[PDB]
């Protein structure tokens, strides 16, 4: 893979500074990646421009352009600003070209490799039941499939901002896409909805999970993330307690309900943001291991490792303050949490080339048979009180 264009751009930030100078590489494989300075010599699809849509604007700043991509079921936007209108032209152009190049090669390849795959549901099929979320480009609502009584989450996006179940992720602890359909003006993703309750609620009612209970949920999270990282080459970047639910049997479900994007007040939950995300530094697989660390700290201590009602002070704590533990935590748990919450992503547990393997080899998870974790052969320490039972 070769560099196709490179140079400085102001990158809009959502957390601290608003506009930050970053040195960006555009590569022929589609990756468009920014760095704090000219970097001196695995790729994540999060940073791909493939199938992007490019738009020019003049607010807030002149000479700004926006890359907009549908990543799985989420519309994400990357906003940028240069000094001259000509500069913008060269960038949007360089980006379109790489992107068209990728579409072209890909279509040619599947045209040539199609194997009698040359073959040829709607709103009314569903009962609305509750808004799960709202955002720039659409909403997420709880629905009941009328024909079956089964409950789903439907993500409803505005089709204009954009313009698949055979391409699902076969991992048990991720949210599966059930159906995907479009209307005259909408694009709709029907995805599983766990009915074991929200882990945030379960944790709240119980005050704390024991180390063995947290170990079970962590193993299942670690397994879902290893899969995202290594099978799909994507970072989740969205790990928080409120995005963890339980299925009927007590196994983890990581939700896929996010819309738009987060971040005086912040438009979401900032207490799980990794340092490098706050600083708009470059980030990779290791941000999800930081979120793991915050989630398991919360499970085993019954409170966040860093909190303040002022997000500014919270941000300071996350970047600067050393982790403190309750007296009742053991050393194996303290070792895992302190390694996952290393502020420098390069020295974080999981931040090396081995990624998830480092975490599964940590002594905290000794004895966990990861093949059995993947196969739901582990026995849940808690069975929610419940199939189509609206208990929660």
């Amino acid at each position, epitope marked *: 893979v070769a560099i196709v264009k490179e140079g400085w751009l102001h990158k809009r930030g959502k957390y601290i500074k608003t506009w930050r100078p970053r040195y960006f590489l555009l590569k022929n494989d589609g990756t468009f990646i920014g760095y704090k300075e000219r970097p001196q010599d695995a790729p994540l699809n999060n940073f791909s421009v493939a199938q992007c849509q490019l738009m020019k604007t003049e607010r807030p700043r002149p000479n700004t352009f926006i890359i907009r991509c549908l990543q799985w079921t989420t519309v994400i936007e990357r906003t940028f600003h240069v000094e001259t209108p000509e500069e913008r032209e060269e960038w949007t152009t360089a980006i379109q070209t790489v992107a068209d190049g990728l579409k072209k090669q890909e*279509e*040619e390849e*599947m*045209d*040539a*490799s*199609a*194997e*009698h*795959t*040359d*073959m*040829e549901v709607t709103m009314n099929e569903f009962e609305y039941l509750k808004l799960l979320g709202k955002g720039t480009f659409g909403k997420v609502i709880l629905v009941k499939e009328k024909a079956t009584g089964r409950y789903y989450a439907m993500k409803i996006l505005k089709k204009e901002v954009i313009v698949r179940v055979l391409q699902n992720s076969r991992h048990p602890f991720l949210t599966a896409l059930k159906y995907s359909f479009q209307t005259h003006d909408r694009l709709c993703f029907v995805m599983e909805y766990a009915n074991g309750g929200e882990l945030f609620f379960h944790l709240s009612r119980e005050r704390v999970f024991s180390e063995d209970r947290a170990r079970f949920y962590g193993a299942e999270i670690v397994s879902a993330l290893d899969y995202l990282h290594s099978e799909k080459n994507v970072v989740y970047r969205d790990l928080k307690l409120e995005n963890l639910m339980l299925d009927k049997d007590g196994h983890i479900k990581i939700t896929d309900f996010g819309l738009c994007k987060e971040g005086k007040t912040f438009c979401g939950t900032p207490e799980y943001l990794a340092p490098e995300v706050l600083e708009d530094n470059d980030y990779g697989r290791a941000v999800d291991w930081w979120g793991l660390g915050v989630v398991m700290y919360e499970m085993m201590c019954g409170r966040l490792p860093f909190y303040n009602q002022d997000h500014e002070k919270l941000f300071e704590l996350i970047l600067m303050e050393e982790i403190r533990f309750p007296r009742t935590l053991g050393p194996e748990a303290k070792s895992l949490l302190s390694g996952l919450l290393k502020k420098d992503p390069k020295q974080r547990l999981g931040g090396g080339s081995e990624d998830a393997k480092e975490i599964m080899q940590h002594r905290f998870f000794a004895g966990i048979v990861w093949q059995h974790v993947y196969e739901k052969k582990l026995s849940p320490p808690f069975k929610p009180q419940v199939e189509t039972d609206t208990r929660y």
Partner: nanobody, 114 residues
Framework: QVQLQESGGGLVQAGGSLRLSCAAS????????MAWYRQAPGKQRELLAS???????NYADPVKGRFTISRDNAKNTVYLQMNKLIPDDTAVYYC??????????WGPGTQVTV
């Protein structure tokens, strides 16, 4: 202009035969799976036959043995030989590539009636 153009339709006495031809201009039939389809007034468009780049053919049951799909690499064209035809064959006939199929792009089609 890149496109596919079907030709060779018309009326024929049942049990007759017909050769439909799909002229790709702007596309390389040699690099693509090509298929033939048909659609009748009240019905959904029906996949009929495919020919992979190797040349491997394949046909759907209603037409197994009666129709043959062939690719003339030299002539950048696909062909569908229609033998021992039936009223239930009456329809508009389209040819297509995988990519155009998934984008719902179609040439003009040619109408056939038994």
């Amino acid at each position: 202009q890149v496109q596919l153009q079907e030709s060779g339709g018309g009326l024929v006495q049942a049990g007759g035969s017909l050769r439909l031809s799909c002229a790709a201009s702007g596309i390389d039939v040699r690099i693509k799976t090509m298929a033939w389809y048909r659609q009748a007034p009240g019905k959904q468009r029906e996949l009929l036959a495919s020919v992979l780049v190797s040349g491997s053919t394949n046909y759907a049951d209603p037409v197994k043995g009666r129709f043959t799909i062939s690719r003339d690499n030299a002539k950048n064209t696909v062909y569908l030989q229609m033998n021992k035809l039936i009223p239930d064959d009456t329809a508009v006939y389209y040819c297509n590539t995988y990519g155009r199929l998934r984008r719902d792009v179609w040439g003009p089609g040619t109408q056939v009636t038994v």
